[PDB]
Amino acid sequence: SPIETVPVKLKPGMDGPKVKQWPLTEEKIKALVEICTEMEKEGKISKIGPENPYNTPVFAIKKKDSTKWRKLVDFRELNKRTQDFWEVQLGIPHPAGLKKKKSVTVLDVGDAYFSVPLDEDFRKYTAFTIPSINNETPGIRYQYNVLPQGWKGSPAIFQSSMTKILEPFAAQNPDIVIYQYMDDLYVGSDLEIGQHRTKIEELRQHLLRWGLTTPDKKHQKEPPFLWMGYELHPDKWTVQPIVLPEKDSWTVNDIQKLVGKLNWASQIYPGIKVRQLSKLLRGTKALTEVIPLTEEAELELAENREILKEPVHGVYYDPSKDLIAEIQKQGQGQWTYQIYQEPFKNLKTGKYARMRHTNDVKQLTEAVQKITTESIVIWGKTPKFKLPIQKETWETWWTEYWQATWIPEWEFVNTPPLVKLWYQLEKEPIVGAETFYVDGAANRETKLGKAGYVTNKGRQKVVPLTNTTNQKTELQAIYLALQDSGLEVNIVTDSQYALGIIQAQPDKSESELVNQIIEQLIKKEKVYLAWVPA
Amino acid sequence: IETVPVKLKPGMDGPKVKQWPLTEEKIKALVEICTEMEKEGKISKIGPENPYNTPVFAIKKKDSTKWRKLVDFRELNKRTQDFWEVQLGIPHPAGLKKKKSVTVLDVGDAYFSVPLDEDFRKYTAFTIPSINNETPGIRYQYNVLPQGWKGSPAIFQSSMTKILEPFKKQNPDIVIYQYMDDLYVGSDLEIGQHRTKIEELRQHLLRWGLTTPYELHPDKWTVQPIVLPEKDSWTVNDIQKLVGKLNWASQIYPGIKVRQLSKTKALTEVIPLTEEAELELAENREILKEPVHGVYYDPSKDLIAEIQKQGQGQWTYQIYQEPFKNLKTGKYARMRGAHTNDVKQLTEAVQKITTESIVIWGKTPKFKLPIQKETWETWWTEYWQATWIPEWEFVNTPPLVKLWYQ
Numbered sequence: 023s024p025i026e027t028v029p030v031k032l033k034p035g036m037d038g039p040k041v042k043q044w045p046l047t048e049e050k051i052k053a054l055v056e057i058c059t060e061m062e063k064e065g066k067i068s069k070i071g072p073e074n075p076y077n078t079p080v081f082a083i084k085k086k087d088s089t090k091w092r093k094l095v096d097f098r099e100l101n102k103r104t105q106d107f108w109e110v111q112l113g114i115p116h117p118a119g120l121k122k123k124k125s126v127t128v129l130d131v132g133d134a135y136f137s138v139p140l141d142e143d144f145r146k147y148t149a150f151t152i153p154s155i156n157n158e159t160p161g162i163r164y165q166y167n168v169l170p171q172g173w174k175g176s177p178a179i180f181q182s183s184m185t186k187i188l189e190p191f192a193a194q195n196p197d198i199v200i201y202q203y204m205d206d207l208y209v210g211s212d213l214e215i216g217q218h219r220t221k222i223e224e225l226r227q228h229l230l231r232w233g234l235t236t237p238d239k240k241h242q243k244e245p246p247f248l249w250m251g252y253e254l255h256p257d258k259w260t261v262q263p264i265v266l267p268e269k270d271s272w273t274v275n276d277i278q279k280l281v282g283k284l285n286w287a288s289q290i291y292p293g294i295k296v297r298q299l300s301k302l303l304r305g306t307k308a309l310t311e312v313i314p315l316t317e318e319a320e321l322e323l324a325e326n327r328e329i330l331k332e333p334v335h336g337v338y339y340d341p342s343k344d345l346i347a348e349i350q351k352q353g354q355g356q357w358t359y360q361i362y363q364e365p366f367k368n369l370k371t372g373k374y375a376r377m378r379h380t381n382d383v384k385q386l387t388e389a390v391q392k393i394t395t396e397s398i399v400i401w402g403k404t405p406k407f408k409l410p411i412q413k414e415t416w417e418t419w420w421t422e423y424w425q426a427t428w429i430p431e432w433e434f435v436n437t438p439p440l441v442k443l444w445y446q447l448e449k450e451p452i453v454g455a456e457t458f459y460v461d462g463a464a465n466r467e468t469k470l471g472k473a474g475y476v477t478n479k480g481r482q483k484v485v486p487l488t489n490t491t492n493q494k495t496e497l498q499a500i501y502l503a504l505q506d507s508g509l510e511v512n513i514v515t516d517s518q519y520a521l522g523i524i525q526a527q528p529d530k531s532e533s534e535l536v537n538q539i540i541e542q543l544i545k546k547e548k549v550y551l552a553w554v555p556a
Numbered sequence: 557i558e559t560v561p562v563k564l565k566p567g568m569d570g571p572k573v574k575q576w577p578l579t580e581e582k583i584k585a586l587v588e589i590c591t592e593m594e595k596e597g598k599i600s601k602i603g604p605e606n607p608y609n610t611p612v613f614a615i616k617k618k619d620s621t622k623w624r625k626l627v628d629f630r631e632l633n634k635r636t637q638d639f640w641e642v643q644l645g646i647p648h649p650a651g652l653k654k655k656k657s658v659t660v661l662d663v664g665d666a667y668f669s670v671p672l673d674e675d676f677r678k679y680t681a682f683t684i685p686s687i688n689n690e691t692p693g694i695r696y697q698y699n700v701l702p703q704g705w706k707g708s709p710a711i712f713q714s715s716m717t718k719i720l721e722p723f724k725k726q727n728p729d730i731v732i733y734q735y736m737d738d739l740y741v742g743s744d745l746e747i748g749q750h751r752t753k754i755e756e757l758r759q760h761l762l763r764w765g766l767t768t769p770y771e772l773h774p775d776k777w778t779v780q781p782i783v784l785p786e787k788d789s790w791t792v793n794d795i796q797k798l799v800g801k802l803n804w805a806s807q808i809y810p811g812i813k814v815r816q817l818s819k820t821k822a823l824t825e826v827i828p829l830t831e832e833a834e835l836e837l838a839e840n841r842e843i844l845k846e847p848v849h850g851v852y853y854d855p856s857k858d859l860i861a862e863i864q865k866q867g868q869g870q871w872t873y874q875i876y877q878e879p880f881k882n883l884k885t886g887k888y889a890r891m892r893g894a895h896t897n898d899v900k901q902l903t904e905a906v907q908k909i910t911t912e913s914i915v916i917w918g919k920t921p922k923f924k925l926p927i928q929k930e931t932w933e934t935w936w937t938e939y940w941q942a943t944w945i946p947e948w949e950f951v952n953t954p955p956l957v958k959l960w961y962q
């Protein structure tokens with residue numbers, strides 16, 4: 023209230039709210055006048071009526087009853103008209119990144135907004151009105167002197183005010199760490215508990231001298247702290263308990279929520295999968311349609327139910343002991359990783375899924391990238407990696423891949439399933455091997471096609487195909503040539519699509535034809551694919 | 557000194573770009589730099605009434621062991637300078653590309669001595685970020701002409717023209733062009749004569765108050781020629797790759813004779829070159845020797861650079877504005893024994909291509925980079941030694957044409 027206000031202007035070229043006050047019951051009016059004089063007594067709202075053309079609606083309701091009503095203001099029309107602000111806490115600190123302090127205290131700040139002043143020349147826009155009997159008698163008109171409840175500027179201005187009030191106490195107390203969140207302070211120190219409590223009292227007094235009230239009893243409940251869907255214990259952190267429901271039918275909404283809770287749990291519970299269980303969601307965006315659970319998704323839900331039966335915790339961060347991430351392959355495009363500093367307790371866990379004909383080494387590389395980003399956010403450095411791939415495998419892939427790639431400091435781990443390259447085409451043609459001039463073709467309308475080959479030895483095959491596409495038959499021609507050749511074969515296609523897919527050296531695919539082609543290319547010994555214009 | 561008023565494009569609102577997360581090391585370097593800057597008036601802390609933001613980074617310019625702040629003013633440049641290439645433009649000399657040597661002097665410190673219009677400072681906001689979202693982030697705005705902003709050298713050019721006038725009088729053959737923070741200085745001297753002249757310009761700038769802390773040769777053989785392989789013996793698959801390359805070039809060059817060369821043998825079988833075949837091959841090498849037709853630089857459309865990784869540290873690039881109408885092609889290759897990697901090479905190549913583009917047209921190109929977006933966004937600063945930043949975007953379908961540009 024001696025706090026320096028922040029200057030606030032309206033969006034350029036707008037006036038203030040001139041909204042209708044749709045009257046309500048007289049009892050609501052009485053409760054509003056009670057709370058309005060009690061709020062004027064504290065100087066939060068002063069009553070000036072005559073020359074203010076602005077107005078904003080006011081309602082009354084009871085939700086959490088101390089035998090009292092409560093007043094609220096629909097500030098939508100005003101919020102739409104005030105300038106933008108610097109945004110907010112744009113996300114949450116992750117518990118894995120906090121550093122253990124010998125004590126932490128939580129301080130809920132009281133009527134936080136109502137005890138921070140509003141810029142003077144702006145107050146006229148907060149003006150509101152109380153009617154007496156449906157305009158038979160005039161009503162009383164007020165404006166705000168403080169940050170109104172639910173106005174666009176209140177959070178960021180309150181953050182700025184609180185930061186400024188804190189920095190004198192912060193500078194006379196460098197042994198103490200204060201973190202801000204919407205209404206709370208979190209104070210951590212490595213001071214002996216008596217000293218820590220003396221400092222917490224000093225801070226409370228400091229804040230009280232600026233109009234900010236604070237829990238006078240024993241402060242917010244001792245650890246563990248239930249905060250932002252987490253559980254924070256003096257030496258560990260975990261997620262709040264996650265209970266998956268058992269039901270007969272599932273709407274798209276229920277699977278959305280189940281996939282969500284499983285993702286949340288995946289940050290500390292190692293092994294959770296969401297692949298076959300959100301394959302159900304891609305169908306459409308229809309909200310209440312009931313989806314039949316597949317058999318894969320049923321096993322997945324059970325498998326998560328089991329790996330979730332026993333609780334798991336994570337530790338906090340020690341900056342003196344180095345940072346390690348270790349990666350494992352799971353299955354159908356699914357990977358998991360653990361980030362730790364020591365071998366029995368993770369800082370956190372996590373999973374990577376593929377989005378879009380794919381390749382295991384490229385996928386591992388994308389996993390290393392996702393982890394590297396997260397590490398930089400949470401801790402501000404990058405981990406040393408433990409990867410199930412060999413230096414020659416990786417050196418071979420990245421020296422040949424068409425994109426540039428950064429390969430951080432990594433050490434190989436011999437936990438299967440290892441990541442390998444399963445075949446490599448020849449760079450030059452093969453002398454002594456048969457040459458297959460393959461081609462294929464479909465018809466866009468009849469959905470009938472052919473695939474075939476002509477070889478230099480005079481061998482020729484043509485196989486008919488139903489329900490195919492030009493690209494499908496283009497790959498089927500290559501598959502025919504692989505099926506009918508020896509262990510060394512040159513293949514010649516005129517299909518850019520085919521040569522692209524196959525030259526990408528994929529390992530698996532959501533297409534059975536390419537899988538059979540892959541199993542052939544593994545079975546063969548030397549295969550030189552080559553391309554000519556159509 | 558009064559401030560030049562800056563009223564950005566009508567209806568345009570200020571930059572609101574998110575700030576990348578950074579290493580602790582770089583956050584600390586930024587805090588140090590910015591604390592000295594605030595102590596010297598160049599920037600001031602801001603409040604929530606200022607909603608704008610503009611990314612910042614920590615780099616090490618010119619191989620120094622001390623850090624350097626780099627503001628990414630691309631968004632603000634599009635939002636202001638698109639009416640400050642018009643109202644306050646710097647004309648680009650068409651002869652700088654023709655001098656035999658060109659040195660690049662950094663003259664950025666200059667801008668820090670000129671105040672910036674108060675009504676404009678709001679839009680130069682930037683956040684030093686915290687780790688793990690732990691603290692709000694430190695919020696500054698500029699009170700002096702910021703480096704990286706395209707309006708700074710615009711505003712300063714009167715001063716720069718005046719400072720440079722005695723040198724330009726003493727040396728009327730030398731070309732001097734100011735791109736954002738650097739003078740490019742071109743001459744036709746012997747390399748030692750050129751170095752002497754450049755140090756004279758350094759001392760002339762210094763004795764007028766401009767502190768300044770690696771030569772180009774733009775007789776650089778503009779769009780490079782593609783060559784067909786030359787061999788004693790020609791195989792079936794050699795004929796195949798030759799035909800296929802020559803058909804791709806039908807998109808750029810019109811007159812490639814094809815049929816005489818297109819006439820079920822095995823791939824490894826050596827087919828002798830026909831008289832008609834060698835005839836078509838000679839006619840085609842000749843029709844490739846000459847440069848392209850209809851290829852002129854349009855100054856209304858933007859420039860586009862494409863880069864391909866060639867293995868063994870080699871990278872090809874083309875600069876164009878219409879497909880196959882290449883304005884400039886070339887080839888970059890890092891040091892033979894140096895310890896370098898993919899992203900290092902990509903970054904030095906982007907920088908080299910951008911410097912060439914400045915010398916030649918006074919504009920930078922938009923790059924289509926062969927790299928995963930998140931990888932580049934993470935690692936591009938580690939080797940970035942330049943003060944400007946070109947626009948870019950990421951390719952994810954490969955060229956199944958790779959050799960065709962090698």
Ligand SMILES: N#Cc1ccc2c(Oc3ccc(OS(=O)(=O)F)cc3OCCn3ccc(=O)[nH]c3=O)cccc2c1
Pocket residue numbers: 115120121122123124125126127128199200201206208209210245247248249254255256257338
């Ligand atoms: N409601 C609520 C709530 C409570 C506390 C929070 C919180 O405490 C801390 C503040 C500064 C700290 O200092 S620092 O980050 O190293 F500079 C370290 C901190 O708690 C991390 C270690 N921890 C945690 C709990 C514990 O019992 N014991 C312990 O050890 C941080 C973030 C959000 C918080 C939210």
